From Swiss-Prot, chain B:
The chain holds residues 156 to 207 of 551 of the full protein. This is Methyl-accepting chemotaxis protein I. It is found in: Cell inner membrane. It comes from Escherichia coli (strain K12). Belongs to the methyl-accepting chemotaxis (MCP) protein family. Receptor for the attractant L-serine and related amino acids. Is also responsible for chemotaxis away from a wide range of repellents, including leucine, indole, and weak acids. It comes from the Bacteria. Disulfide bonds: none annotated. The chain crosses the membrane at residues 36-52.
């Protein structure tokens, strides 16, 4: 349950940062990893919760 | 912050995994004491019955 709950936090935390990255594209503030890369990390973290 | 966050996760999951190994070895080694403690009981009977 530790890694499972941690996996959910990493997923939720990643989704929170993912939405912030999308706001930068609308307001044009700096650059970095695209939104597709951030969403992919949340997907891997989401599946990690099911495994744990 | 993603680097520092993910950095601790590697040592976090690695540290928790080490606790399981050290705990399983303790339970595994404990099983030996449980078995040996049982053979001593039956072993004492071989000496008692031999004395009787």
């Amino acid at each position: 349950l530790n890694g499972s709950w941690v996996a959910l936090l990493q997923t939720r935390n990643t989704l929170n940062r993912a939405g912030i990255r999308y706001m930068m594209d609308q307001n044009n503030i700096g650059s970095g990893s695209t939104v597709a890369e951030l969403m992919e990390s949340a997907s891997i973290s989401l599946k990690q919760a099911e495994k744990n | 912050t993603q680097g520092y966050q993910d950095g601790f996760e590697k040592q976090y999951v690695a540290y928790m995994e080490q606790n399981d190994r050290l705990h399983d070895i303790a339970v595994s080694d404990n099983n030996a004491s449980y078995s040996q403690a049982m053979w001593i009981l039956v072993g004492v009977m071989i000496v008692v019955l031999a004395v009787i």
